[PDB]
């Protein structure tokens, strides 16, 4: 039977991959970083509170200039804030209020939105009429949009619950590339600093590293016992961190093709909603359903700090490109900037 | 006051934006949001037509009350990842077709459609996001149920049934079986209505159930209850 032979062959390849990975386990990360000085307790304060959303905040994204911010709430609004003054620069009403993601273009000209309508809407922020207009609507996903990231001004990448990712050419509105291989819903995306690779985590408890141009899956990383909800790249682009519903974060290395470290505690049993690194990459910030955020020592796996101040689930995290501040948004309707 | 002219202009713009946001929130707080659920071709569409590929929204007004109905069918993705986005809905309208007792799923002929409907109902009502959300149950296609019970007893799907092959008893038995799935009887209420392809009291029934839900919530928020 061809099928038996194929299944057996698959198992042989999986065993070969496992053995090749195990052969590269010379020494754990925790043994190498045993002699590193601990960062110490990290204490941060709330500098700003951003009020105005009247429902749960589901996503936010920092502008590349480290000052402007976009947040999305299911009260039907996308708000662009000035974080230094707390002024609301823009308030964009959405045709569909079931938004679950938003993005800020690197040039700052465009914003992206999406959610349960299966559509990625592109809004132009700098027009001659003085308004914000829907410059485009990308359709073609058969499930909800979970994450989007502007790869450029004319290209965007999206992930949805139909188990696939898509690279879209905004000008023509068509989908240029499709990334298939996940067996569950794709929950999060993280572009590489050089933008030539991206990583995605799915509800099948796995992460995949995709090559943008080729349209091929480069690598598959496993180890989480539940859904992966958040994912982020290490600042130098050679490793990433994933958070799941099993109440743990994990750090995976691209070149070793394995998992370097696990970030877990006995007092934490809720899921992880968001993860991001600090500029150096030394600290790993993760938001939880416990209503707060933990700051971990990425190189030693010790809890370095706690950010508390939200009355409901912390849904989204961000760190500015200049490293000055963190932003947290939760289901309590507030965004808070910390430093 | 330490601000330049342009900074004051920007602050005034922010104040106008806040004013607009408050007005929109006030308008939205007065709307009654309903979540429509059903097991595929269960008469849901007939309910929609009578009362009026992602989420679909219907808007209608009865007696000065604005209802927004969200149909979340045609989303063949995991439900647990987006169900929590409907946590604040006033009520869940659940549609069940009474003829399914004599039918099986096309994808699985060994599974009875009524059992699938009961499983979906049980999952929805006992879900952790909807502990206090009431359910309005619409048992559609009652006419066709009266024309088949006399020939196809409920023992086909309900072996323990020991009643007559009359609609009056079979309908009550089915309503009991569906209300036995509620394990939170101290927090949520279930409203049941028998309807058919030619019924006009469907909107009035929804109005009454939603009014009861709203008044009970107000009382619970004011004490008393």
């Amino acid at each position, epitope marked *: 039977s061809e099928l038996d032979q194929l299944r057996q062959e698959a198992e042989q390849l999986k065993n070969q991959i496992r053995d090749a990975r195990k052969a590269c386990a010379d020494a754990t990360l925790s043994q190498i970083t045993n002699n590193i000085d601990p960062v110490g307790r990290i204490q941060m304060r709330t500098r700003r509170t951003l009020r105005g959303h009247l429902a749960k905040i589901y996503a936010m994204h920092w502008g590349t200039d480290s000052r402007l911010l976009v947040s999305a709430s299911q009260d039907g609004k996308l708000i662009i804030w000035d974080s230094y003054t707390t002024n609301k620069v823009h308030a964009i009403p959405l045709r569909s209020s079931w938004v679950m993601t938003c993005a800020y273009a690197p040039s700052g000209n465009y914003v992206a939105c999406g959610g349960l309508d299966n559509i990625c809407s592109i809004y132009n922020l700098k027009t001659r009429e*003085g308004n914000v207009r829907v410059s485009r609507e990308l359709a073609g996903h058969t499930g909800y949009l979970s994450c989007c990231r502007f790869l450029d001004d004319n290209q965007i990448v999206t992930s949805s619950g139909d188990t696939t990712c898509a690279l879209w050419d905004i000008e023509t509105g068509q989908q240029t590339t499709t990334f298939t291989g996940h067996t569950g819903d794709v929950m999060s995306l993280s572009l590489a600093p050089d933008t030539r690779l991206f990583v995605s985590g799915a509800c099948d408890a796995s992460a995949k590293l995709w090559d943008v141009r080729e349209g091929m899956c480069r690598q598959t990383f496993t180890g989480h016992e539940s859904d992966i909800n958040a994912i982020c790249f290490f600042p130098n682009g050679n490793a990433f961190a994933t958070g799941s519903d099993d109440a743990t974060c994990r750090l995976f290395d691209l070149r070793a093709d394995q998992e370097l470290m696990t970030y877990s505690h006995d007092n934490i049993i809720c899921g992880i909603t968001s993860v991001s690194f600090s500029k150096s990459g030394r600290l790993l910030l993760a938001g939880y359903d416990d209503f707060n955020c933990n700051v971990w020592d990425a190189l030693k796996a010790d809890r370095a700090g706690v950010l508390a101040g939200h009355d409901n689930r912390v849904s989204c995290l961000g760190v500015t490109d200049d490293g000055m501040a963190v932003a947290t948004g939760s289901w309590d309707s507030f965004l808070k900037i910390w430093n | 006051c330490t601000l330049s002219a342009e900074d004051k202009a920007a602050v005034e713009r922010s104040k106008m934006i806040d004013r607009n946001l408050r007005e929109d929130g006030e308008k939205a707080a007065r709307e009654v949001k309903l979540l429509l659920l059903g097991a595929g071709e269960s008469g849901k569409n007939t309910i929609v037509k009578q009362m009026k590929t992602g989420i679909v929204e219907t808007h209608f007004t009865f007696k000065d009350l604005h209802f927004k109905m969200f149909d979340v069918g045609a989303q063949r993705s995991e439900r647990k990842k987006w169900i929590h986005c409907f946590e604040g809905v006033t009520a869940i309208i659940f549609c069940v077709a009474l003829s399914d007792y004599d039918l099986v799923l096309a994808e699985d002929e060994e599974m009875n459609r009524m059992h699938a409907s009961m499983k979906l109902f049980d999952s929805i009502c006992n879900n952790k996001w909807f502990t206090d959300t009431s359910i309005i149950l619409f048992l559609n296609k009652k006419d066709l149920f009266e024309e088949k019970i006399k020939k196809s007893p409920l023992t086909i799907c309900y072996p323990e049934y020991a009643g007559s092959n009359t609609y009056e008893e079979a309908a009550a038995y089915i309503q009991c079986q569906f209300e036995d799935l509620n394990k939170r009887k101290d927090t949520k209420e279930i409203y049941t209505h028998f309807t058919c392809s030619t019924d006009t009291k469907n909107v009035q029934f929804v109005f009454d159930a939603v009014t009861d839900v709203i008044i009970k919530n107000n009382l619970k928020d004011c004490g008393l209850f």
Partner: single-chain antibody
Amino acid sequence: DVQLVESGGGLVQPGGSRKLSCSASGFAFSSFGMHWVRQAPEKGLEWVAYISSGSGTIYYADTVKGRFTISRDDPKNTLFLQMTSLRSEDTAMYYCVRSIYYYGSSPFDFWGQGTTLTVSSGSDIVMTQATSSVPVTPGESVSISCRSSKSLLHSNGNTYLYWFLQRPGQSPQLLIYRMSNLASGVPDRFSGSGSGTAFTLTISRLEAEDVGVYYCMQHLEYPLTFGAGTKLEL
């Protein structure tokens, strides 16, 4: 297409009253604040009045305060200036200017065409442009200087200096909206720099289309003040 059309000018007797109107088309009129700026036959620009979006804040230049009233009609997309007790010094061409203020915006980015109104019979910042005219040749670079009596650098880091250009027989047009910020649609050959109280506008590869009068404005505090205007020739 963005369009501002002004009407209501003409000849009026001293002591009379005329109403000027500015009809707007092709943009979100209610989101913009509006200015009325005049240019007497002396070709120097004078800011007259300002009404914000939402009509919350209204400012007048002292020379006209108590005689002019500025108002808006958002549903009809029209701006109004009510002028009473007219004096010969009110003869001028009046321009309707739109300006929108938020972080990173570009104020004074579109000017109207103007209405010619003819009448028969201390703490303000002073902006100086020493050179009135400069003979120039195509293909060569030119430098235009502006001086301020008070530093235009604010504690927030912005230098509120605006450069405008007016070609023969046309409305002024924005070139640099904040020291070193080129305006939308402006050729890259124009560049600006400065410090505190001394500012420079540099033009590279001069073109025949770049001949006109260059104006310097400060937006640090009301009333808004313009320069005398530097003229390019040949």
